[PDB]
Amino acid sequence: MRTTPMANASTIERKWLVVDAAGKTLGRLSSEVAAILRGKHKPTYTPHVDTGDHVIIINAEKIELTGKKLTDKIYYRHTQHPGGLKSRTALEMRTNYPEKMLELAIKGMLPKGSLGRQMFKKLNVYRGSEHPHEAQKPEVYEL
Amino acid sequence: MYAIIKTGGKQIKVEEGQTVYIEKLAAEAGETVTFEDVLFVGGDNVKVGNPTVEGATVTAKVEKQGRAKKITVFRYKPKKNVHKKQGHRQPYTKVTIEKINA
Amino acid sequence: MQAKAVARTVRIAPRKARLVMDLIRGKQVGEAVSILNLTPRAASPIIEKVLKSAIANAEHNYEMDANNLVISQAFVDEGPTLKRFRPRAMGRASQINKRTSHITIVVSEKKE
Amino acid sequence: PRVKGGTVTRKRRKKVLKLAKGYFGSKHTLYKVANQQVMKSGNYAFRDRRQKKRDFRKLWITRINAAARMNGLSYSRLMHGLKLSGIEVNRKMLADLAVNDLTAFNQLADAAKAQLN
Amino acid sequence: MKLHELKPSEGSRKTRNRVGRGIGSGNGKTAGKGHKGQNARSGGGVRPG
RNA sequence: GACCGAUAGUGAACCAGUACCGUGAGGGAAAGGUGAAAAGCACCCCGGAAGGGGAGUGAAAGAGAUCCUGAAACCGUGUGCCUACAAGUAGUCAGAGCCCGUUAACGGGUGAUGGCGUGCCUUUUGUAGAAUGAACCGGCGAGUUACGAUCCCGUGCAAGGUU
RNA sequence: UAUCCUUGGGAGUCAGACUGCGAGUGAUAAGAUCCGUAGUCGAAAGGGAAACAGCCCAGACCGCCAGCUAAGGUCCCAAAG
RNA sequence: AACAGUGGUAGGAGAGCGUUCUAAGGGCUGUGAAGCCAGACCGGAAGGACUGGUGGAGCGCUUAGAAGUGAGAAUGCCGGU
Incomplete structure (x- = not known):
């Protein structure tokens, strides 16, 4: 046999989470x-x-x-x-253009080629220390 | 009742009304096999965690033997001229649970 | 119901001819004929006339009506490269070809 | 008596091109190129057949690891408590059930606490 | 005996002919092949001569 | 004739030693098929002209004048699935959506994109190659037979066999 | 014990290659050049060393969405404190 | 039954499959043979056959023996592109 269960469906729906970045290392x-x-x-x-x-x-x-x-x-x-x-x-990057450090440090942890760059799009960087993305219902979460 | 049972080297999730694709056994047609090797109960039950529970005993109604279709395997060795081929098909069984006896 | 047509003994390459054939598709006979007639080349009045005569026959004998007909489909397919001599230099014996085509056309009634 | 061996040739040649289904390009439209792809297909096949079983393992381990973090433990001490309890390992495949069923997830967490670092 | 049961008893069924039509099912690919630098030749294609 | 059956076989299956090539001695090709019977297209329509387009022919007109059966390359036509932020010697394997509907295993279609990746034959230890040949597809074609010799193994006699 | 012994019938092979261990050559350098040993490859996939048949893992006719080690890891992607 | 397994080149050893033909025991066919093309063809380890469409006049299983005997590449050979 080779029959198998899955659990992809349950956990994928393109949900929305926020993660702090204000005073944070954003590396570890x-x-x-x-x-x-x-x-x-x-x-x-x-x-x-x-x-x-x-x-x-x-x-x-x-x-x-x-x-x-x-x-x-x-x-x-x-x-x-x-x-x-x-x-x-x-x-x-801290001495002007501060947006780019958070971008290339999260792109790097998602490459697969095509599909990798898709996952990247679901990231929004912002800089006001708040999200205007409250329209999609985010909640604090980490692994 | 929720249950999980041993199918030789692998395990399968099993409830009180589902067919399952399993390894080959001699049995076919309308025969009866039992799986008293039921090693987890957990969906409305609680288990932790000696091998096998005696609070359940899955019972199966053997429902025909089918086969996994032929799949050509082949190794070519270039400029050494070997071309040994093989095909796996082989019989397999399917069984239908319909009662997990207590 | 439908009328066939073919042209023989013309000068035009298959690749070239495919263009005009597929472009007259879904269009009335009355339009299609006019096109071919005033398309430049000496093969034009020839491929025109034969196609036109196929229409004519279709009416009298097989009970179809010119005005009502369109072009179901038409195409042109690769055939032999016809060697008809033209000089090619360097002391070499070679021909620049004067190919011919196998024109397929299916006219048919849109209104019976 | 003699035999050409020449009736045979169309049988052998035609088969290769007609066993190529879902193949791409012009490599399954030309005989001499189709041959080379049969060799590819068989070599690749056997290697990936065995490779894939390791990839499913390198999938299940991940599932468990994620679930494990949300019990206040981690995969090392989770799996340890499962195996040392006896059963409650439930392969690695079927331990995907820790998302789907709460009742299951509770038992795998109880089993984890039993033996820890 | 019978003409529909000619059946040699190994007086012509001793047989067995070594392969060479095969590319490596049995032994060898073609005549005149070994592993030496003198293979694929008419002369020098033999080891023993 | 335990000879060959249309790219096989005489140079030549056929209006071939023709065609074609050399001042010359001489070299030297490709080409079969409508039917059992021509009944080889009456009847009609259009075009400068080649032809066809309907209809009839006859058991059969994919038997309609490269007309038997008529593939593959090549070139198109219809349709089901599939993709406009994506990286590839072209497949393999996994999921996944939509489509379709197995004679039986109770079934077939595709690629959205992940994991993974050294052309075939050489030549060698080893060529995936920028040493080799091959544009492509089809046909054609080489492990053949005899006679001495030595083993085998099947038989006859059995110290004799043998013309 | 696919360990030895003996006879008869067919072999193929003189161009091996690379690494660890030990001696000689060298301008004492060079998968350089010569070999004793063991090994792999040649003549087997495949595992690890980012990208390598030869070191290191191992000898896989063939399927398994099974578990255990080696090399190699556990923060994430190309799996795991 | 239980025990054990190692299936790769030069070669040795063992079986079988396809193709044409001759042989003697046998059988289809114009109410459709051989062949052409597709098919999710049940059945192979692999080399391998049982269905529908077309086709339009002859065909072959077993038991045996035979050979230009399974292609493709030869700056190979002929035709089409």
Whole structure:
């Protein structure tokens, strides 16, 4: 035999969760968030095809990675810009353009190619220290 | 009654009215097999957690033997010229529960 | 009910001819004939005339009506590349072709 | 007597192209290219057949791990209390039931507390 | 005896012919093959000669 | 004739030593089929002209003048499913939606996207390759037979067998 | 005990390759060049080392949505304190 | 029954399947043979046959023996594209 039960249906409906980001590290926190963005927070079919769930950071202007850890953070991209390989750090993302640290740190924890970039869309970064996403009923949750 | 039983090396969830695809057994047609290896009860019952419970005993009505359709397996070895093929099909049984006796 | 048609002995490539055939589909005979007649090429009045004559016959003998008919479908399919000599240089013996086509057309009544 | 071996050729050749169903491109429309895909198909088949069973395991472990966090324990000490109690392991497959049925989830949590780190 | 039961008793049913039509079902792929650098030749295709 | 059956076989199955090639000695092809019988398209319509388009023919007109059976490549036509933020030597395996409806296993159709990934034959230890050949599909074609020799194994006699 | 012994009938093979262990060559460097040992590969998939037949895991004719180790992990994705 | 299993190249050893033909015991056919094309064809380990449509005049299972005997690639061969 090879008959099998499932539990994908129950736990996937594109529900909405918020997760704090105000004064938070958003590094060690983000890891636990990524789990839930892929669909996994209870028994779920999730290493393979399934739509994710919405999980939203509430802030983006109080992201401090704390101590020396901050300064020597790594980020990369390889674009069609004449410099190719651009490399940046959390420290200089904090010194203007503070939105980008939270984006590339949660994209990185969801890649699968096509399906990976779908799950990414369900993230909204914001920066007011509040959500206007109360229209979709969010609630605080972590793994 | 809720139950889970052993089907050799694997387990299957089983209630008091459902068919289930199981491994091959000699039995077919209208025969009767029992699964007193019922090793979890839990849906309206409570178990924790010696192997087997005596508060339940799933009973099955053997309902025909069917087969899993043939599926060609093959290994080619290029420039070594081996081409050994095999096919798995084989008989299997299906049984229908309809009563989990206490 | 339906009228067939075919053209023989013309100069036009299959690839080329497919275009006009599929484009006259769903359109009345009265329109389709006019198109072909004033399409440029020397094969035009030839493929026109044969198609037109298929219509004519259809009325008198098989009880159909020209005005009512449309074009169910039509197409042109790859056939032999017809070698008819034209010089190709470098001392080489080769022909630039003058292909022919197998024109399929199915006219039919839309109103009986 | 003799035999051409030539009636046989259309039988052998035609079969390969007619066993290719749901295949893509022009690789199942051309004979000599279809051959090469039969070799692919068989090699791939056997490797993935066994690989997949590990992937279902690397799926079930995840399900349990998620449920486990919401009991105040984690997967290590959960599975430990299951196995050490005896049964209440319930494979890993069927322990997806901890979302679906509350009654089940309670028992797997009671079993967890029994033996812990 | 009978013409519908010609049945040799191994006076012509001793048989067994080594394969070469097979590509590697039995032994070998074609005549003149081994593993040496002199294979796939008419002359030198033999080991023993 | 325990010979061959239409790309197989004579160079040549047929108006072939023709066609075609060399000043010359001489080299050298492709090509079968409407029926049992022509009854080979009366009757009609249109076009400059080639042809067809209906109808009849006759057991059979996918038997209608490349007309037997008529595939595959090639080129189209209808329809079911499927996709406009996506990464690929092309499949494999998993789920999932929608569609359809098995003779029997009680059944068939697709790809939305996940996991995973070295062309066939060479040449070698090993080519997935930028050393080889092959545009593609179909046909055609090589492990053949005899006679000595040595084992096998089936038989006859049995110290004799053998022309 | 697919351990040894003996005879008869068919072999194929002289181009192996790479790694660990130990000696020689070298400009004392170079899957460099020579080999004793063991191993894998050749002549078996497959596991690990991000991307590698040869080290490390193991010898899988074939199916299982079963469990146990090795190598390798447990914060997440490409599974797990 | 129980015990044990190792199924891969050069080769050794063991069985079988398809294709044409001759043989003697047998059987279909114009009320539709051989062949053409599809099919979720029951039954194979693999090489492998039982159904419907078309087709339009001859066909073959067993038991045995035979061979240009299963392709494709040869700067292979002929035709179509």
